[PDB]
Design a protein around this nucleic acid. Structure first.
Ligand SMILES: [Mg+2]
Ligand SMILES: [Mg+2]
Ligand SMILES: [Mg+2]
Ligand SMILES: [Mg+2]
Ligand SMILES: [Mg+2]
Lengths: 143, 149, 66, 101, 67, 213, 134
RNA sequence: AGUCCCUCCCGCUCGGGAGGGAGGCACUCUGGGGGGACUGCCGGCGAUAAGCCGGAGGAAGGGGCGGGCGACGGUAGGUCAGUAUGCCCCGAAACCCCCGGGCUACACGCGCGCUACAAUGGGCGGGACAAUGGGUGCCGACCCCGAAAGGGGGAGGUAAUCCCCUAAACCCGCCCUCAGUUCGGAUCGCGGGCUGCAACUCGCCCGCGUGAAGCUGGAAUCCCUAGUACCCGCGCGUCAUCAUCGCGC
């Protein structure tokens, strides 16, 4: 019954690790969201990931695709109150970075102040820059 | 013997066991989704993290007398790891504790002394000392020096 | 008043702000409601760098002041 | 009876003992019991400051300090003595307060 | 390889920085077994000690009139 | 771990309540009057000896050892390679952790050889203490490196210090622990093996001490 | 008959009471046999083991402490217990062994911390900042 | 603490323990007044003097330990932007008020620090013990709503009474096993709150998610002699909110 490599919704996950860490790899599921889903699904977070039969994979894929309707509350979700509709959503790898990218483009359009910083690759949240954030290369004068 | 006659952790472990049979103690609807205080980082790991909290709360009003909610939140706080800045002490949440005290009240082990907090009942002292004696009647085999008292 | 919060009344028209020395037009469109008025009128001229001078480094500090 | 309670508090220590012994003697001369002056904790107010007007030079500080000595006396009430402790004429750097229980 | 010697008197502090001490030892088992020589030591020393040395013939150079 | 050992009550004034220093026997006549072996149940003196000249003569050897592992490592002088500055996770003041690692160290030593662990220790602290040194003596204008002799007390200090630093470099960023790396050092030094660090340092001191007599 | 003695150790006071009994001894209500930091349990059993399992079985002691930390109250307990034992039995061939093993078991420790001074003033009296030429 | 009543618990009680209330200043404590240490007592240097070494007895020993108090003068050292002040300019202005911006800009060189580069550790559940100080424009016990920040009520306190205030490093039990990792948490997206007349420029706090450099540091250079250095937390100040700082514990 034992296996070495399993896959759930894109990224494939190790099989000699505990179930709660094996899911950490999926971009969009940290550690505190993994404990939750493993509990709600109905199985331990300490079982060896290789021991996952496939109907349980079907269960997990169900949960990750609309978790609010299974018990995962709407204060612990990737993004609440979607800017296009007040629904509360939890996205994962492929859909995630695109959503952030369009949330950035939206600020680039109207030419806000928080969009131009994203343009020029500078701080965004009000830091100081006389002394740190030196992502460049030294300049000389004379010797 | 009493609860003053054994170490705290062994007694709490043994109490939390029998506690699982009182029908009033049962975990609320948001227990699997909560960490215990703004100073932690990860959720509790065992499945019965409830019964340990409640059982530590009994022994905590036995030998502390009239004690109140905002004083059981200083006890269950800790030190925080807040990034690039130094560490600092913080209190704990409220719901996990208020529910525990209301459930122990409904069980019959504590009671609301008005204006001064809560204290333990006779039923509660019987409950705790019976288990303390039950344990100690075996901690003296491997430690033959407790036999005196 | 750069603090004013854009609202569904102001969508469509074009009002001004005051960025310190002059009034700068901000053609209000949807997707602005919620933001602040002064958020669209920047206030410091973007910086472009010349060349280090006498003191920019320990090699030109006392070799100049005699 | 009703056990008046008097509370003296002053910054000069000597000029307190004399009013204390006045009260003690007055009580003694007449017929009344008394609980001797019970010293209460001193309250010392402390103020740390820098020392130089400008900002140049090393940093050196001051420690100013003001101490306030207190006492407490318990005594019964007899008008022969309750009055006798009214012509006592405290000094100007002392505070007195009288109240019964 | 094993020659021990028993200090009887301290003479003073030599050293470029006050480190070494000149001291007059007496050997107690071996070739001399009774002779008295003069040697420099590193560390602290009382009287009655037992140093262990390896030559029994070096005779450190005299010090500046002990002061 | 077992509740019989977690709760342990002695009924004899021994060392740590376990081992008795009645039969150990110091060979070197030089180091005999400095290695103390009195009964002294608990090794803790609360730093009273570090006030009086030659105060550290009458302090139990186990406490002299425990004190010379309450430190962070090599902080301005490399030891076999690198610095090992480990601040905020070093045991500088934590005497409890020190006493614990030394207890477990002895429990391992007693098993892999079979002798009173303090006899093995007193063997280790003689096959690691060298008795020749070097200096510079300025004379009439100039100096030059000359060889000298090391007094006993300083021999003992250097011995224990090198044992410390030897164990405290194999537990560094490596799978082996600290209590067992304090054993793979004493079992070696007490047997004159080259793989040690305390003994090798003695040889490489005595070499460049002899070669410039 | 009863006796009662004292012991202070850098902000920790201890009040002891000694009287006949079965040989048990409590500290704040804890039995001596149950003190977790073993290095602090072996610290208050030195008078009661240096007297023998004969005197240790004809007295009851019960101390109370407050202040300090797990190791600055163990020593207070030890001082009070030694000063009590040297009076109940009231001999001197035992008081002597309380000076060869450790002289402070009866005289206590006169050491306290030392105030802070103004160059860092939160680290200690003698530790300062780091000099900066150039 | 030793006596005296009442209530309640455990092996069912011979013994042990917890609260009250009656009484007492025994012990701790608070703070006024006295005592105690002088090279005084022995041995050795130095003259026999000044004095210096070692030993007793002692709670303490050789300015008892830590602080306050800085001479005549100099430094054309710093401060006219704390107050005072002579001379020269402004005098319908360089004087007095009000709204919005800046001091928070960023190819770059430097000073002082905070967090790490892991096992002399990271996480989760239990168990332990402090002191200085502050509160009436303010400190908030106790009860109830919330997952968390917080919100609605609200005793007692002008103080050895009520409140801030059951500290952290430490210990026991289980997971990880030498890996850019369950190390490291910068940088960013979305949602919920507090102070404020006003949070975009530019305040602070919470929950989920993403997860950068970093594997012990070249020549050089700094601080420390005992309850001192190192390691861990706390309180005042500044303050309507905000401490990686200063001054104390
Ligand atoms: Mg001048
Ligand atoms: Mg000048
Ligand atoms: Mg500035
Ligand atoms: Mg981490
Ligand atoms: Mg803002």
């Amino acid at each position: 019954d034992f296996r070495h490599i399993v896959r759930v919704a894109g990224v494939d996950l190790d099989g000699n690790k505990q179930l709660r860490w094996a899911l950490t790899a999926i971009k969009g599921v940290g550690i505190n969201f993994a404990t939750m889903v493993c509990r709600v699904a109905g199985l331990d977070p300490f079982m060896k990931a290789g021991y996952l039969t496939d109907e349980q994979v079907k269960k997990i894929e169900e949960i990750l695709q609309d978790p609010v309707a299974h018990g995962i509350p709407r204060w612990a979700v990737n993004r609440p109150k979607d800017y296009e509709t007040g629904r509360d959503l939890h996205l994962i790898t492929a859909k995630l970075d695109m959503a952030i990218r369009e949330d950035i483009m939206r600020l680039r359009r109207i030419r806000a102040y928080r969009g131009i910083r994203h343009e020029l690759g500078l701080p965004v949240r009000g830091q100081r820059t006389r002394s740190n954030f030196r992502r460049g290369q030294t300049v000389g004068v004379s010797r | 013997a009493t609860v003053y006659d054994v170490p705290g952790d062994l007694l709490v472990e043994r109490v939390a066991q029998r506690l699982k049979e009182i029908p009033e103690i049962k975990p609320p609807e948001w227990a699997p989704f909560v960490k215990t205080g703004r100073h932690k980082e990860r959720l509790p790991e065992q499945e019965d993290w409830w019964y340990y909290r409640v059982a530590s709360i009994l022994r905590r009003v036995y030998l502390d007398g009239p004690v109140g909610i905002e004083r059981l939140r200083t006890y269950y706080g800790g030190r925080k790891n807040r990034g690039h800045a130094p560490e600092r002490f913080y209190k704990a949440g409220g719901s996990i504790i208020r529910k525990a005290l209301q459930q122990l009240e409904a069980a019959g082990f504590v009671e609301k002394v008005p204006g001064k907090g809560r204290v333990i009942t006779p039923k509660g002292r019987s409950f705790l000392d019976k288990i303390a004696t039950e344990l100690k009647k075996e901690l003296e085999e491997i430690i033959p020096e407790l036999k005196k008292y | 008043c750069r603090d004013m919060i854009v609202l569904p009344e102001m969508v469509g028209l074009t009002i001004y702000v005051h960025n310190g020395k002059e009034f700068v037009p901000v053609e209000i469109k949807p997707e602005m409601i919620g933001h602040y008025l002064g958020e669209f009128a920047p206030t410091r001229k973007r910086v472009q760098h010349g060349a280090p001078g006498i003191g920019a480094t320990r090699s030109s500090m006392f070799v100049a002041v005699k | 009876m009703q056990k008046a309670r008097i509370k003296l508090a002053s910054t000069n220590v000597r000029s307190l003992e004399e009013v204390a012994n006045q009260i003690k003697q007055i009580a003694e001369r007449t017929g009344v019991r008394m609980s001797g002056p019970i010293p209460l904790p001193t309250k010392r107010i402390r103020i740390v400051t820098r020392k130089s007007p400008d900002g140049e030079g090393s940093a050196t500080f001051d420690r100013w300090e003001l101490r306030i000595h207190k006492r407490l006396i318990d005594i019964e009430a007899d008008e022969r003595a309750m009055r006798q402790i009214m012509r006592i004429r405290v000094p100007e750097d002392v505070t007195i307060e009288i109240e019964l229980i | 390889e094993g020659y021990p010697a028993e200090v009887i008197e301290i003479i003073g502090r030599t050293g470029t920085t006050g480190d070494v001490t000149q001291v007059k030892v007496r050997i107690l088992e071996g070739r001399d077994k009774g002779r008295v020589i003069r040697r420099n030591v590193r560390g602290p020393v009382r009287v009655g000690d037992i140093l262990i040395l390896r030559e029994t013939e070096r005779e450190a150079r005299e010090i500046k009139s002990r002061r | 771990k077992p509740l019989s050992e977690r709760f342990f009550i002695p009924h004899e004034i021994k060392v740590m309540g376990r081992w008795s220093t009645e039969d150990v026997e110091v060979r070197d006549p030089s180091l005999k009057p400095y290695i103390n072996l009195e009964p002294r149940l608990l090794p803790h003196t609360h730093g009273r000896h570090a006030k009086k000249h030659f105060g550290k003569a009458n302090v139990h050897i186990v406490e002299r050892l425990i004190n010379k592992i309450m430190r962070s490592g090599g902080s301005h002088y490399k030891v076999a390679g690198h610095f090992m500055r480990r601040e905020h996770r070093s045991l500088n003041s934590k005497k409890v952790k020190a006493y614990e690692v030394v207890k477990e160290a002895f429990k391992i030593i007693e098993k892999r050889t079979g002798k009173n662990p303090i006899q093995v220790l007193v063997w280790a602290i003689e096959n690691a203490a060298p008795r020749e040194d070097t200096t510079s003596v300025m004379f009439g204008g100039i100096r030059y490196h000359v060889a000298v002799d090391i007094s006993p007390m300083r021999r003992l200090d250097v011995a224990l210090r090198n044992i410390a630093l030897g164990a405290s470099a194999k537990c560094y960023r490596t799978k082996m622990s600290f209590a067992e790396a304090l054993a793979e050092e004493i079992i070696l030094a007490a047997n004159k093996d080259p793989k040690s660090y305390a003994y090798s340092k003695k040889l490489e001191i005595e070499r460049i001490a002899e070669s410039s007599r | 008959r009863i006796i009662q003695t004292t012991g202070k150790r850098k902000t920790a006071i201890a009040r002891a009471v000694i009287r006949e009994g079965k040989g048990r001894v409590r500290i704040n209500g804890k039995p001596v046999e149950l003190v977790e930091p073993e290095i602090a349990r072996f610290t208050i059993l030195e008078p009661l083991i240096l007297a023998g399992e004969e005197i240790w079985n004809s007295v009851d002691i019960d101390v109370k402490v407050q202040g300090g930390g797990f190791m600055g109250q163990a020593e207070a307990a030890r001082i009070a217990i030694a000063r009590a034992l040297v009076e109940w039995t009231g001999d001197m061939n035992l008081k002597e062994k309380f000076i060869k093993y450790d002289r402070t078991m009866l005289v206590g420790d006169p050491r306290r911390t030392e105030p802070h001074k103004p160059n860092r003033s939160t680290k200690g009296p003698r530790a300062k900042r780091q000099k900066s030429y150039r």
